[PDB]
Write a protein that binds this ligand. Structure first.
Ligand code: WXL
Length: 176
C-alpha cells in the first residue's frame, strides 16, 4: 500500500542462546535483517511481545570481537543494577537501537558497529560497539551524545573499553 522508508544502513538482529556445553561462537544466532523503518518496528514490536542476550549490528559485521570491523574497536558500557531491569532496561535498549538506526552521532555514526544488551540476574548491561578504539574524537563524541540521549546523571562516568583489553582482562581507554 505504501512506500517503505529506507534506513541509512541495513542491520542484523542477533541473539546468544546460552548453552554451556558449546564453545562461545557456536551459540550465536543471526535472527533476521532489515533496512527500513517499518521492518525495524515490526521486529521490535514482535520481540517485545515474545543470560539470553541480543545485539543489533550493521550488515556484514558479526557481533564478536573476532570480526575485522570490531577487533581494533571497543564499547561504551552502561551498567544497570538489579532494580533497573524493570524501570530502565527496555527504555535504555530502545533508545540505544534508535541511536543506531537513526544515525544519531552524525558523521561519527560511520564508526558504530552495533549494540549489545546482556540480560543478567546479577545486573543488566548495554553497550554501543565502535570500530577503532584509537579514534578519540569519534569515540568521545559518540559517548557524550549517548550518555545525554539516555538522560544519565552527568556526575557518573560511563567507560569506553577496548575489545583488546576486555579479551585479555585480569580498564577504561576513555570516560564521559
Ligand atoms: N570469543 C568471544 N567471547 C566473548 C565475546 C566475543 O565477542 N567473543 N563477548 C562479547 C559479546 C558479543 C555478544 C553478542 C551477543 Cl548476540 C550477545 C552477547 C555478546 N557478548 C563475550 N565473550 C565472553 C563471554 C562472556 C563474558 P560476559 O559475561 O562479560 O559477557
Amino acid at each position: 500500500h505504501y512506500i517503505k522508508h529506507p534506513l541509512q544502513n541495513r542491520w542484523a538482529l542477533w541473539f546468544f542462546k546460552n548453552d554451556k556445553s558449546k564453545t562461545w561462537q557456536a551459540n550465536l544466532r543471526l535472527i533476521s535483517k532489515f533496512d527500513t523503518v517499518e521492518d525495524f518496528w515490526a521486529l521490535y514490536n514482535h520481540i517485545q511481545l515474545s543470560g539470553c542476550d541480543y545485539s543489533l549490528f550493521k550488515d556484514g559485521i558479526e557481533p564478536m570481537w573476532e570480526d575485522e570491523k570490531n577487533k581494533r574497536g571497543g564499547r561504551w558500557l552502561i551498567t544497570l543494577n538489579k532494580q533497573q531491569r524493570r524501570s530502565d532496561l527496555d527504555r535504555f535498549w530502545l533508545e540505544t537501537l534508535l541511536c543506531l538506526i537513526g544515525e544519531s552521532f552524525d558523521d561519527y555514526s560511520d564508526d558504530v558497529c552495533g549494540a549489545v544488551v546482556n540480560v543478567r540476574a546479577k545486573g543488566d548491561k548495554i553497550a554501543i560497539w565502535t570500530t577503532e578504539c584509537e579514534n578519540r574524537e569519534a569515540v568521545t563524541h559518540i559517548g557524550r551524545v549517548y550518555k545525554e540521549r539516555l538522560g544519565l546523571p552527568p556526575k557518573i562516568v560511563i567507560g569506553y573499553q577496548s575489545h583488546a583489553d576486555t579479551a585479555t582482562k585480569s580498564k577504561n581507554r576513555f570516560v564521559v
